[PDB]
Each structure stands twice: as C-alpha cells, then as structure tokens.
C-alpha cells in the first residue's frame, strides 16, 4: 500500500474490484 500518487491509488483500487 505504498502509493504516494493518484495513478498508484487508482490502479490499486481498480485491481481490487
């Protein structure tokens, strides 16, 4: 969960669903 950007957060959330 070491994101630090909107892209990282976006890819992380999208993958989880």
């Amino acid at each position: 969960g070491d994101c630090r950007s909107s892209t990282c957060e976006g890819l992380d959330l999208l993958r989880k669903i």
Partner: antibody, heavy 122, light 113 residues
C-alpha cells in the same frame, strides 16, 4: 455546485516568476487530488503535476520539477502553482482541475477552472 | 520522455450537420489494465475548459448525448460522432490515465456549411 476559479495570469518577461491561484468551492478539498494542466496557444494539453491537500503529497512531472512547485492553503480551500525562471515555452492557458473516482473505479478530470493565461513576452 | 504518447488522426477535419465522423487515437504503449482501457475523450469548445465525453474507452459521461461513442483497446482507439449536431464543433482530445496523465495533440472539428 462544484467549482474551480483560477487567478494570477498575465504577461511576464523571460527569467521572471509568477504565482497562480486555484480557489475551490462546493466541495471540501482535502480528499481529492488537485492538478495543474497547461495548454499552449493553439496546441494540446500538458499535465504539470498534482497535490493531495490532506497530506500535501505532491508529484510534479520531471519536465517541471526544477522550476514549478505546487502547494495548498487548506484554510482558503485553494491550490497554488509557483512558476520560476519562465521561458517563452511556458506561454499557455493554465488550468487547475481535480480527479474523481467512479463506483466502477475509473478516475479522470471532471471539473476544471476557466483557465488563466500566462504570456512570456520579450 | 518516458510518457505514454497519444497521437490523434486527423489534425483537423470539416463535416456537415447530420454527418458521421471518426477521430482516432494511437498510444505508444497499451493503456489497458485488468480488462479495462484507461482512455478518455475530452471536448474543448473555443475559450472553454475541456469537458469529459468518454471514459474507460467506451463509457459515456453523464448527460453526454448517445451520438458520441468510443471504441478500441490496447494502443488503438476511435471516437465516433454519428449524426453531427451544430454544437459538436470543437477540438477533441484523447487522454490516458494508465501512466500519470497525457493527452493527444488534439483534432479540430469544424462545421461545413
């Protein structure tokens, strides 16, 4: 209603500096990634960087990293872009915008400001 | 630059009300992720800010007319405007969110009278 209002644009001599403001309204700021995007006259759109106001995490594109800084004033619900050592290539309409995420997980720029013009004259 | 480059075709075009038009967008690398294509289409009216039309290559943004449709995957995308309306004349940009944020160079659509 969600709104973004830019101010601070004008004519600047090369090597000059300028601070742009983005006043956000109709939503509390802190949750969202706030961005600066520019558009050279008659040209395409270029992403400068982003800021998350709550923790002030900032990511500026490599191209602008040495002269452009993004900051926030949470009390004023505003984002700022500090531009230094301006060159002719910085002449553009500067927009602030935000990214939102849908229930399906897609994120994109939804609301934009009206834009402010920065002209780097001789 | 290490950015995902987006190249649109054509650079500008003209057509009449009722015509069908297509604008293409080619990415330097795939903009896909977990079966989704992270590709948006924006419409920019003169002197105004860009307005989202399509997101995730084929999804219509709320309130956007059905005459606008998006297709494609990987590195090749198309924006189709069936039956042009007078208000549809603007500069169109494809935009990707797979890696940071980039935009195509823009395609100017003008009315032919």
């Amino acid at each position: 209603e969600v709104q973004l209002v830019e101010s601070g644009g004008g004519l600047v001599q090369p090597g000059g500096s300028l601070r742009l403001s983005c006043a956000a309204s109709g939503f509390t700021f802190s949750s969202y990634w706030m961005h600066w995007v520019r558009q050279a006259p008659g040209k395409g759109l270029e992403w400068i960087g982003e800021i998350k106001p709550s923790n002030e995490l900032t990511n500026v594109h490599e191209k602008f990293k040495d002269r452009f800084t993004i900051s926030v004033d949470k009390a004023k619900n505003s984002a700022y872009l500090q531009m230094n050592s301006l060159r002719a290539e910085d002449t553009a309409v500067y927009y602030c915008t935000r990214t939102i995420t849908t229930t399906e997980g897609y994120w994109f720029f939804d609301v934009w400001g009206q834009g402010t013009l920065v002209t780097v004259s001789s | 630059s290490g950015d995902i480059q987006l190249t649109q075709s054509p650079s500008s075009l003209s057509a009449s009300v009722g015509d069908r038009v297509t604008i293409t967008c080619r990415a330097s690398e795939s903009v896909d992720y977990y079966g989704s294509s992270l590709l948006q289409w924006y419409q920019q009216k003169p002197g105004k800010a860009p307005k989202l039309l399509i997101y995730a290559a084929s999804k219509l943004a709320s309130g956007v007319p059905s005459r606008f449709s998006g297709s494609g995957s990987g590195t090749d995308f198309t924006l189709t405007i069936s039956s042009l309306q007078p208000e549809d004349f603007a500069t169109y940009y494809c935009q990707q969110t797979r890696k940071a944020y980039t935009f195509g160079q823009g395609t100017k659509l003008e009315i032919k009278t």
